Design a protein around this ligand. Sequence first.
Ligand SMILES: NNC(=O)CCC(=O)O
Ligand SMILES: [Ca+2]
Ligand SMILES: [Ca+2]
Ligand SMILES: [Ca+2]
Ligand SMILES: [Ca+2]
Ligand SMILES: [Zn+2]
Length: 316
Amino acid sequence: ITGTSTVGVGRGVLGDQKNINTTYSTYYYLQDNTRGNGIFTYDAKYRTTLPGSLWADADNQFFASYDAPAVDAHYYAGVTYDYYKNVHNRLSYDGNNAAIRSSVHYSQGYNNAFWNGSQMVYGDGDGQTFIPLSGGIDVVAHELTHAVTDYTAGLIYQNESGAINEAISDIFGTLVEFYANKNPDWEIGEDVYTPGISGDSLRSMSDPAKYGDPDHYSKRYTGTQDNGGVHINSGIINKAAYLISQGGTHYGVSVVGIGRDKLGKIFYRALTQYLTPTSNFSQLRAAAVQSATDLYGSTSQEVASVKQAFDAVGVK
Ligand SMILES: NNC(=O)CCC(=O)O
Ligand SMILES: [Ca+2]
Ligand SMILES: [Ca+2]
Ligand SMILES: [Ca+2]
Ligand SMILES: [Ca+2]
Ligand SMILES: [Zn+2]
């Protein structure tokens, strides 16, 4: 809407206070005009019709329990925008400052979040498996990264291409979590998963097998569940990315880590210059090797480490 840019304050899903960019015109709206063509957060009001109504608040204070998922969806979308702009010189998901739209309170007891082709959508969880899913910065950045992928490589959402699509979202979701530097880790969803169980998460990048996901190509899922295992076989690529950044010896193959910032540069270049809608794992290895070569040189440690990491997970 048309109005003047303002700064509200509220509390997120985990009870942390944060400032949020709003817009005033009669009400205060969750509309951040400081980033691109705006970040807009909507109330789906427990329904499944999208987007719902642009979030409106009478006093610019967002401390009600009902407000918390909106505060975090809005704030973490901003952090993710800042990551892509400051770290990769990318302006929003399309590279042209497209407006970023999110809806919260989607459905009833909904244990998921997604990018629907046009916007991000967050359930509240059932209170046992999940709390509201926008409480996880890695979740928010994972979802916005699906938009980045769709506008760049365009990896189709099935089989190996879809597992790459998933791993890209887990990788950048994790790199955004490190960028914000609040309790960062290589786990996915730990801040919103199972409020009754400490120390778990939905997936692990450092040890995918902790939750049953494969960490080697020989262990890949070959059936039809989960669109051909997109959230399962992503573990193979997640492990490779983790090794590239942090190093390790895995199935007897030693990898010298090169750090998160270089991991991000290599995979961002692979995503935006070399991957295609039907790329498979072997083609991702080639894309990553070429990206590291472009950035660091063919004889560089960075290139050598990319090769070792894909070797360690059995991807030639
Ligand atoms: N394809 N989308 C989903 O399965 C929702 C969760 C995710 O973002 O991966
Ligand atoms: Ca209020
Ligand atoms: Ca964390
Ligand atoms: Ca995490
Ligand atoms: Ca938990
Ligand atoms: Zn995903």
